Design a protein around this ligand. Sequence first.
Ligand SMILES: Nc1ncnc2c1ncn2[C@@H]1O[C@H](COP(=O)(O)OP(=O)(O)O)[C@@H](O)[C@H]1O
Ligand SMILES: Nc1ncnc2c1ncn2[C@@H]1O[C@H](COP(=O)(O)OP(=O)(O)O)[C@@H](O)[C@H]1O
Ligand SMILES: CC(C)(CO)[C@@H](O)C(=O)NCCC(=O)O
Ligand SMILES: CC(C)(CO)[C@@H](O)C(=O)NCCC(=O)O
Ligand code: NA
Ligand code: NA
Ligand code: NA
Ligand code: NA
Ligand code: NA
Ligand code: NA
Lengths: 307, 307
Amino acid sequence: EPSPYVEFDRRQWRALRMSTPLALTEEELVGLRGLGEQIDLLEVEEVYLPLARLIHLQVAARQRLFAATAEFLGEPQQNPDRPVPFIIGVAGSVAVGKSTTARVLQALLARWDHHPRVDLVTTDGFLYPNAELQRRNLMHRKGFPESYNRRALMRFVTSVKSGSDYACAPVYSHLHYDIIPGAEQVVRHPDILILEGLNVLQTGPTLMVSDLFDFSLYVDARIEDIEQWYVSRFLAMRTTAFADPESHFHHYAAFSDSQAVVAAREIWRTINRPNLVENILPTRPRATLVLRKDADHSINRLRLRKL
Amino acid sequence: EPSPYVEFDRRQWRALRMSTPLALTEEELVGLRGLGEQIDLLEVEEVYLPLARLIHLQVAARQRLFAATAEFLGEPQQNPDRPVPFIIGVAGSVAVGKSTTARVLQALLARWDHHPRVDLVTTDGFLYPNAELQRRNLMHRKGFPESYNRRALMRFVTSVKSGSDYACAPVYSHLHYDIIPGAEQVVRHPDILILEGLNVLQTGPTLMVSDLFDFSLYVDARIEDIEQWYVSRFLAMRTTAFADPESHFHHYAAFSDSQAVVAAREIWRTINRPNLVENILPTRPRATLVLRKDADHSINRLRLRKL
Ligand SMILES: Nc1ncnc2c1ncn2[C@@H]1O[C@H](COP(=O)(O)OP(=O)(O)O)[C@@H](O)[C@H]1O
Ligand SMILES: Nc1ncnc2c1ncn2[C@@H]1O[C@H](COP(=O)(O)OP(=O)(O)O)[C@@H](O)[C@H]1O
Ligand SMILES: CC(C)(CO)[C@@H](O)C(=O)NCCC(=O)O
Ligand SMILES: CC(C)(CO)[C@@H](O)C(=O)NCCC(=O)O
Ligand code: NA
Ligand code: NA
Ligand code: NA
Ligand code: NA
Ligand code: NA
Ligand code: NA
């Protein structure tokens, strides 16, 4: 039966790497991974390099499209010092490691002949402040589609891809568990913009951010494996993030492995799992590329959208 | 404020026509319009020709994209006697005249240097049979997303764009108000496929037909104007379609203008309007191009998606 996709396994996928050069040390790679992520240079070669290649082959082809319309409209060409920004979306569950995938991808792309300005933005900064979430009675739905100012988010990405000289985005603090007053991330006509978030790949009755993606990734893995990673990381943060007297979660630092496991599981069960099942997973079918990880966090299978 | 769209009016739009040649008579145009549609050659020049142009500028650019991926995958090029079919979607309310727009567009495109095989398919043939609709208790929701075998529909379009030599689709009879037993429409590796239907532009938790469109149209107009056209056409069919002793609607032929108006309005109010408001309209934001018609059925404004 015909299919819009093409499946792979490491063996098959690594061959699509070609001459694609490695321009990252085992050290730089380290400052790019999050607590719990395993990514090593091998994986960056057999997985992230082919990906980088494909993305590069597309940025060109994708440019033709905006040019065609530009030509149709009889517009004054298109300054190469400012093409239509290539937007890339990275979606997936909480704790699946999309922040690592996004960081590595960014580094790989910024390191390409001519040094493309490659900006990265997470949707965290588009969550409503805690005060506003409390007002809407959503302090326990952080991460759900409605906990986000999707209008501001859409406005942001639209601004950037429309060619704006610069756009601003609020900043989220994981330390304080809330939006930072007066903080902002300024993005200047990037060549590539990577938007990382839980629900970035979703659709609706209004034009959305996913309707502006030229390429998208969905970091996937088994729900039981991800819960495993979540709980695991929760216990591990008792001595990293939670250890800080300022962490909005400082009281967890003192929990016993047992107490911690109970607490972590409760959050997963009441917040992150429901959201994964009801909102995130239903968006996976549209990802240009799905990166399937195994219990060890390694990407061993990939699903590509050829159609 | 930046926008993904660009608005136009006839004046502005007709200028984008350029050398685009007219290859249709006032006679051929006639056998292409439906009861109630006004389209004349002027409109075909000031509106449909620019459209044809844009579409042509895109088919090329769009080809680069599949080639890029083909190249990425190290595939044996791509025979010009069989490129990736260009899929075009035409959506809109019942009675808004999308069947005319689809027919005219098809004719215009088939009449292009090298004579592209341009096939046209409506979603009518993907409705469940009346027997099956009665079973699901949906005999009064014909046209709603659930009255369609979306799996078969998706399979069909996927088959065609995936390069299949030929694909089949059931055939709907407006005369009998049901699917025709054993009837089928065979489509052979077209260069362009136009898919016309009510809900063709919608999304969901599964990859859909709208995810395969390379270009899409949304024939729009005011809901009161469309109801007007609907009722109007209903009365007019008393002596055309309904007049046939076989029409599943033959009893309406004998209605008085008054009775007819009452009946028509009831259907609009209980079926076609709800579906337009709940399912069709929410899809308009994604149309590559929106053709806005006035009470007289003429397209006087257009909204294009540049992003
Ligand atoms: N409570 C927390 N305190 C500090 N840092 C956190 C906390 N929760 C998550 N983080 C970090 O911020 C990012 C959150 O990742 P998550 O939201 O789990 O998405 P993912 O792991 O798929 O990138 C990761 O770097 C994670 O390690
Ligand atoms: N009851 C009917 N009997 C015969 N033909 C019909 C009937 N209803 C609609 N048609 C015709 O079949 C097509 C249905 O169009 P509709 O389903 O109203 O979409 P649109 O008018 O936007 O193309 C049009 O050609 C219409 O004239
Ligand atoms: C950024 C948060 C809070 C939400 O996006 C999430 O990434 C997280 O790390 N843990 C889930 C806890 C919560 O969502 O309340
Ligand atoms: C093809 C139908 C029936 C539905 O697609 C519709 O186009 C129509 O012409 N009139 C609405 C009547 C009904 O949908 O039952
Ligand atoms: Na941010
Ligand atoms: Na997308
Ligand atoms: Na690994
Ligand atoms: Na059909
Ligand atoms: Na579409
Ligand atoms: Na007209």
